Each structure stands twice: as C-alpha cells, then as structure tokens.
Amino acid sequence: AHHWGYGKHNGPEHWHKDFPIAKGERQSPVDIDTHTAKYDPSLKPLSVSYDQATSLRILNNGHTFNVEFDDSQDKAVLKGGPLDGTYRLIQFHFHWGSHDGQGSEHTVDKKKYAAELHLVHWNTKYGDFGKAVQQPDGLAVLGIFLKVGSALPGLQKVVDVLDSIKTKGKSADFTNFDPRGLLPESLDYWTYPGSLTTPPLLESVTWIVLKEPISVSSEQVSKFRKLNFNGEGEPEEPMVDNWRPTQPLKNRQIKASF
Ligand SMILES: [Zn+2]
Ligand SMILES: [Zn+2]
C-alpha cells in the first residue's frame, strides 16, 4: 500500500526514510543563483537533434504523465554542451503546481515557475536506461521552465489526450509527437551535476536547465491539474504540486553557457 508520492506522509520531506540518498551530496533540484553561477567559455554548444524523434505512448504513472520515446536507436539525441558522448531521448514529463505561482522544481534567484518540463536522456556508453541510471555519468535531463501567458501550439496534442489517461496505470498510444515544439528559441543554459528529483533519487544526472522559458496558457496547465495520482477504484487525489523543493548545492558549481 505505502508508495512514495507528494503527500504529507509519502512526500519529499519523508523520502529520506525509504531512500536515504535523498540527503546525498548531489541532490536535485537546486536554486539557480544568477550572481554566483559563473560563465564557462569552454562549454561546447548544445546540440539538440530531435528531427527523427519517435514518440510511442503517453501514460499516467501516478506521479506525473510521461511521453515515451523509441530509444532503440540514435533517433532523438542530445550532445555537446557539458556532455561526453551521445545521450538518447527516452521520455519527457512535467512537474506543476496547484496554482500558477508554483510548480517548477528548479528556481532562478528563488523564483518559481508555473511548471517545469524534463526531457530525459541516457548515455549510449551504456546498454540501456536501466544500466545508465545507476551511473554518475548515466543521464542528461534537459529542464525547461513554463510560464503562464500565450497558449503553446506544440503542447496542444498532449493536452487534448490527457483525458484518456486520467488515473494511474493508463497508457495511451501517442505517435508522431514532435518534441521540438516544446523548446524555446534560445538554448543558453545552466548546468550542474545532480540527481533524479524523484525516488530513487539516484545521483546520475547531468542537469541542463535553459534560461528561456516557454509560454503556456493557464488553460493548458489547468488541464494538467485534471489528472489524478490515484488509480481507478481508489480515492481521488488530483495530480497537483508534484514537484520537489530545491536542495542544498553543497560543493557543486552551476556553470552558465552564456
Ligand atoms: Zn516512504
Ligand atoms: Zn522530472
């Protein structure tokens, strides 16, 4: 019965009990202090190759909704920037709040955005995601802030299908979705070494967080809130505030690409 979540007795403040790495040296998310985050002119340009991205399904895993990608080959791929080698896109998901004033995981000078998008990639030095997720150089997550304003057309295909995966365990067919519609024009970014922001909280993530947010409408985000954490036949719990508070930076340095 007990499973990790975002509630009072299974949430971020409780995770350390069943996942002691929650209190580790490289935990995510962090606050991005733009005064101390010093620029690095050695950082190579970021390369985002999503032209042949091949989506498979959209699903409710009880924590968020995931858009899964075909990672059998080097289709949609992230290279450059702080990354050694090639990282294959496997899935994307969001974090959001109960209201437009909170919802992001990272903060920028303690500012919270309405939501955060995470594009998850794993390093082809390893055989698959299951092997990479255990290694400090295993994953690269591209983090993108959402701010409420203009409706994003590239998000509409996602929003129009959320009613078919309202509850945990539902996974719908979802092909030919273009993740490039979810990117801002500028790819300037901050980067630091970190972790998964959910259990198992493994410290295997090179974080790449873009400075430019994308704009969504209040209506699009409010559709996110119509999802439920629970499965069919369980008490309803709206899926809201599925974000982790920021964690101590400890000895890490956030580097700017710009
Ligand atoms: Zn627990
Ligand atoms: Zn995430």
Curated annotation (Swiss-Prot):
UniProt-listed Gene3D superfamilies: Alpha carbonic anhydrase
Outcome when changing H118 to D/N/Q: Reduced activity
Residues where Phosphoserine is found: A1, S164, S171
Outcome of swapping H93 to C/D/E/N/Q: Strongly reduced CO(2) hydrase and p-nitrophenyl acetate esterase activities, impaired stability of zinc binding
Cellular localisation: Cytoplasm; Cell membrane
Impact upon substituting N61H: Reduced proton transfer
Cofactor binding note of this UniProt entry: Zinc. Can also use cobalt(II) with lower efficiency, but not copper(II), nickel(II) and manganese(II).
Residues flagged as site, Involved in the binding of some activators, including histamine and L-histidine: Q91
SUPFAM superfamilies referenced in this protein's UniProt entry, alphabetically: Carbonic anhydrase (SSF51069)
Entry EC no(s): 4.2.1.1, 4.2.1.69
UniProt-annotated binding residues for substrate: T197, T198
Enzyme class (EC, first level): lyase
Consequence of substituting Q91P: In OPTB3; in Czechoslovakia
Known outcome of mutating L196 to E/H/R: Strongly reduced CO(2) hydrase activity
BP term (GO), one: positive regulation of cellular pH reduction
SMART domains: Carb_anhydrase (SM01057)
Record note on what altering N66L does: Reduced activity
Cofactor(s) this protein requires: Zn(2+); Co(2+)
PROSITE patterns for this protein: ALPHA_CA_1 (PS00162), ALPHA_CA_2 (PS51144)
Superkingdom classification of source: Eukaryota
Residues in Alpha-carbonic anhydrase domain copies: 2-258
Implicated disorder: Osteopetrosis, autosomal recessive 3: A rare genetic disease characterized by abnormally dense bone, due to defective resorption of immature bone. Osteopetrosis occurs in two forms: a severe autosomal recessive form occurring in utero, infancy, or childhood, and a benign autosomal dominant form occurring in adolescence or adulthood. Recessive osteopetrosis commonly manifests in early infancy with macrocephaly, feeding difficulties, evolving blindness and deafness, bone marrow failure, severe anemia, and hepatosplenomegaly.
Subunit relationships: Interacts with SLC4A4. Interaction with SLC4A7 regulates SLC4A7 transporter activity. Interacts with SLC26A6 isoform 4 (via C-terminus cytoplasmic domain).
Additional note from the record: Target of drugs used in treatments against glaucoma disorder and breast cancer.
The protein's name: Carbonic anhydrase 2
